[PDB]
A paper describes a structure:
To better understand the initial step of GAG biosynthesis, we have determined crystal structures of human XT1 complexed with UDP-xylose and various PG-derived acceptor peptides.
To visualize how the different amino acid substitutions are accommodated in the peptide binding cleft, we selected five variants of the bikunin-derived peptide for structure analysis (peptides 3–7). The +2 position exhibited an unexpected preference for the β-branched amino acid valine (and, to a lesser extent, threonine). The substitution of glycine by valine at position +2 (peptide 6) results in a 72° rotation of the 217-218 peptide bond, which allows K461 to form a new hydrogen bond with the backbone carbonyl of the peptide at the −2 position. This induces a kink in the peptide, pulling the glutamic acid side chain at position −2 out of the binding site and replacing it with that of the glutamic acid at position −3. To accommodate this rearrangement the 449–466 loop moves slightly, widening the peptide binding cleft by ∼3 Å.
Author numbering:
A (entry chain B): 211 to 219
B (entry chain A): 253 to 309, 312 to 728, 733 to 959
The structure:
Amino acid sequence: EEEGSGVGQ
Amino acid sequence: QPPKCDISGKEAISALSRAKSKHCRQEIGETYCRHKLGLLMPEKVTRFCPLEGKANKQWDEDSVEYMPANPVRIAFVLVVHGRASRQLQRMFKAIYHKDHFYYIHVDKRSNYLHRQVLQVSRQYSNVRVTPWRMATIWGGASLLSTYLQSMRDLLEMTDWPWDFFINLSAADYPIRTNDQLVAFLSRYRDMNFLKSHGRDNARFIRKQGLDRLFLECDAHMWRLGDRRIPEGIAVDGGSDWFLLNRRFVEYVTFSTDDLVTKMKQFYSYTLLPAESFFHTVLENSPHCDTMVDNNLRITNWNRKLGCKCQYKHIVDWCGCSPNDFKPQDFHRFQQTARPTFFARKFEAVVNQEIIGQLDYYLYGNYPAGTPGLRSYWENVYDEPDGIHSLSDVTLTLYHSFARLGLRRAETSLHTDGENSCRYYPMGHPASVHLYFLADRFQGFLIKHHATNLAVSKLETLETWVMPKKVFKIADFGRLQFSEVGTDWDAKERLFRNFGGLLGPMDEPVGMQKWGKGPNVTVTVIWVDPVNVIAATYDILIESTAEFTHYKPPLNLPLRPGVWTVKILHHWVPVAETKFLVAPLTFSNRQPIKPEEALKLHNGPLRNAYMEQSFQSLNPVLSLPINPAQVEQARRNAASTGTALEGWLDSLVGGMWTAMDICATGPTACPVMQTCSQTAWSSFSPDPKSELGAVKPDGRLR
Ligand code: NA
């Protein structure tokens, strides 16, 4: 489930 | 000077106000105005892949057992930072083979780790270090610049004929042998291994901030505004840990087509670039049909613990990080659902047991009688970096620890004649190590110089200091432990300030650890060295809570001495713990002056720690304020030189114990052991992290 490290602002 | 264009973007104005350097404000304005005119970013890009979409080209665990006739040779690129040089040496030992290649990039800010890596590159012909060094902050655009430059460097190293490109950090570790790795890649040498999110791609774009313009400067990622995704190509991404074959690396490096050119411009101003750059280029290039949707890694995501927006002060964005593996995770490395050869993260200061279990499982146990297998040493100060890289706090306390060791040497020798173990300190500490045994913090190891007064000769010694237990429990409640510290790591649930070293201008945090049980409400109380009650508050312990913490707003400076923190349950005592606010003997690395000591060691500038007062609770908690010791605290606050050193060493000795002290070279103290012959010294044998000659099979392990 490696969906990138970014969450949001 | 004024900008080249009117700057009205709310995001750019916010970054211009927070940037400190003049060079940074200028570069921000220049970037903003270029984008305003449409001269910075591309808006349409050519797609060369013939496929109408993505390809994504049966896992049998027995297929990695054959012997290749034409095995691949691998170029490992290690991007490392921090202090954990002995763990990096252990992992390097596990992955090394004489036929592979190793190219190491050390963060510009980690000079200690760099000096240690240099010693490795000097021993082996197939190990080199990058001459250039960037500050690869989290999410920074510079990480892609690092990879792309190393790819150019490696392609131009004619004498290194490599077939695959693998990137690893100091927190990675193999979960399969090198033999199996070579066998697997030798069968699929024309494939590229990258893992995609596989979910909604529009949500991936937004959460990664790909539609936002970023600029890296002053070791920060500034968000400058919005931007359009280029038309005519598919955008994709996922993990920034991958394996790429030489054919594709050659294309990314030397191609001048519309796709590679515009993507290098687009991703020079992108957050987390390495998490989508290589995916996007591959899927729109002529090599699109070589992509396998698997990076051959196991990444320990735990978004219930690892997504606390812990990089808010480094990047204008919130993100996540993977957790550290623990012993209960060992079975996950034995899955047979898909092929996997590496995993992350591992941290020896967090848990070394799982590292040892994994390494012995792959290459067997060390011979009987091997020392240091359950220990760990980590250097946290090295003399070549200078006392100005320390703080006035750590410099003061490291000095005190050395004097606490000298007093142990003197009292250890029992004689009625001249004491040949009396020493006089000289200079500053030469190095400091953290020391762990079986995943339990043991304290600090300080190497220092001193004059043996009986023979009048200079000696080099190392002292081991351990903190005294201070947690005390007073009806089976849920509380298991309580502690005070700074630099609380929410992902790993521990203080990174391992020693709990604190000075008058520090802002301490209180932590409580709980077990299972129904919800309860408790009361916390902070008490200063002369029984002044600084803060009181109640906290709700929910039935699912495991750790709680809070940082009370205390007016500075804190009165030096031993503080106490109590936990009550409706006035019923529960537990208590203590921590030390040490007075400082240094100001800007120079001896502190009276006028300076007075303002720093006499308590809060506002005469109290908070607006709200708690003088009403002193008689209720049996904490009377002795009028005498209040005045003796005034006298202490005015002392410097010898008097101040005596006050400090008195407080340190009450909270720390000098466990042992050894000599590195010849000594005149008849009762001092040689450090190399002890079990605890950083000079003692540590073969699991030591690197020697290459064996007949081409291995070090
Ligand atoms: Na070398």
